[PDB]
């Protein structure tokens, strides 16, 4: 399994711990993303401080890491 680089909890296949992507290419769990400080309507990646702009959907507008999810689900079986 793989854990989130912030909370170091395990990624879940859906819900509050689902792995979502930032524009820099790094992955963070949904919940940590909701708890990051909001710079106007943008958040900073914790690993490189690069900015990802959020839309009206906020953190839900960030895309899930589908490949990582497929591999994790494969590991589950």
């Amino acid at each position: 399994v793989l854990e989130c680089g912030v909370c170091e909890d395990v990624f879940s296949l859906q819900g509050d711990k689902v792995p979502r992507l930032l524009l820099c290419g790094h992955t963070v769990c949904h919940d940590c993303l909701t708890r990051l400080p909001l710079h106007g309507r943008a958040i900073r990646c914790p690993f490189d401080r690069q900015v990802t702009d959020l839309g009206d959907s906020g953190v839900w507008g960030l895309k899930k890491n589908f490949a990582l999810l497929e591999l994790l689900e494969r590991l589950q079986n």
Partner: protein, 77 residues
């Protein structure tokens, strides 16, 4: 040709193929390739000291299988 170690932000240890003549900026370029952090955001530590760009691995007496520590750029105020 030697191998060194770098402890990234997430704590994972990566191995780098380097030479004594390699500058710190080149090392940071390899770090960017593998981990996706811009060099301007990287701060490399060896023996508790910041590694400046201009110098080389030889200048800091970095030897094979030594470990550098990656932190984020910082500023005293």
């Amino acid at each position: 040709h030697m191998q060194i170690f770098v402890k990234t932000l997430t704590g994972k240890t990566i191995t780098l193929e380097v030479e004594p003549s390699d500058t710190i900026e080149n090392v940071k370029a390899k770090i960017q390739d593998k981990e996706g952090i811009p060099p301007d955001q990287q701060r490399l530590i060896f023996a508790g000291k910041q590694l400046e760009d201009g110098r080389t691995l030889s200048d800091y007496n970095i030897q094979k299988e030594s470990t550098l520590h990656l932190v984020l750029r910082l500023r005293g105020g």
